[PDB]
Amino acid sequence: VNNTKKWKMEFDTRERWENPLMGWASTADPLSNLVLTFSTKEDAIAFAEKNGWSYDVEERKVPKPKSKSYGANFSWNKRTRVSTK
């Protein structure tokens, strides 16, 4: 999960086409590789507002805390018994 620790700013992907000579990916978008790293959401919002970029923010999705129990694999009467281990 160490790649899910920071905020990133990217841009909408523009057109990539086929080079007629080699079949390489030709682009005309200068911002196609511009990925920026921010410690918080507000730093990213402030950097985009300072630069006049229209932005949209997706909130951070954390995994919710699960309830784990190794003994639940061997319940007397619940469906959560493992058929094999």
Partner 1 sequence: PFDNTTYKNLQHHDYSTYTFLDLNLDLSKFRMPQPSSGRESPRH
Which residues are at the interface with partner 1 (CB under 8 A)? 75-81, 83
Report the nearest approach of partner 1 to the CB of residue 70 (Å): 16
Nearer to partner 1, 2 or 69 (CB): 69
Nearer to partner 1, 4 or 77 (CB): 77
Count how many residues are written for the chain: 85
On the CB side of 25, CA atoms within 13 Å amount to 5
Nearer to partner 1, 4 or 76 (CB): 76
Interatomic CA distance for residues 44 and 15, integer angstroms: 25
Report the nearest approach of partner 1 to the CB of residue 72 (Å): 12
What are the helix (H) ranges across 1-85? 41-50
Report the nearest approach of partner 1 to the CB of residue 77 (Å): 4
Q: Are strands 25-27 and 16-18 parallel, antiparallel or unpaired?
A: antiparallel
